[PDB]
C-alpha cells in the first residue's frame, strides 16, 4: 500500500519547468501535466488556462470531461 504527494501551489523549480517544457509535448492535457510535474489536477487545469491567454499553446478541443491542447503550430 502506497501514497502520492502532489503539490497544491507552485515553487520556482517547477514553475520555470512549466514554462521551459512547453515545446517538448505533442499532446498537452491536465492529467499528463499532473503526473509529470507531480501537481494536483485542479492546479494543472489552472496552469493550462494561463499559457493559453499568454498565447503559448493551441486549444484543440473542449468538453466537460476532456480538454485537449497542443504545441504552437510548428514541428
Amino acid at each position: 500500500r502506497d501514497k502520492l504527494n502532489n503539490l497544491v501551489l507552485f515553487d520556482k523549480a517547477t514553475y520555470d519547468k512549466l514554462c521551459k517544457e512547453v515545446p517538448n509535448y505533442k499532446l498537452i492535457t491536465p492529467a499528463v501535466v499532473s503526473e509529470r510535474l507531480k501537481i494536483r489536477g485542479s492546479l494543472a487545469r489552472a496552469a493550462l488556462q494561463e499559457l493559453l491567454s499568454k498565447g503559448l499553446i493551441k486549444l484543440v478541443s473542449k468538453h466537460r470531461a476532456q480538454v485537449i491542447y497542443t504545441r504552437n503550430t510548428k514541428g
Binding site: 505533442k26 499532446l27 484543440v60 478541443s61 468538453h63 470531461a65 476532456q66 485537449i68 497542443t70
Partner: peptide
C-alpha cells in the same frame, strides 16, 4: 464521445 476523443489524441 469516448471513441471520438480517442481518435483526436491518436492523430496528435
Amino acid at each position: 464521445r469516448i471513441v471520438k476523443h480517442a481518435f483526436e489524441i491518436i492523430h496528435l
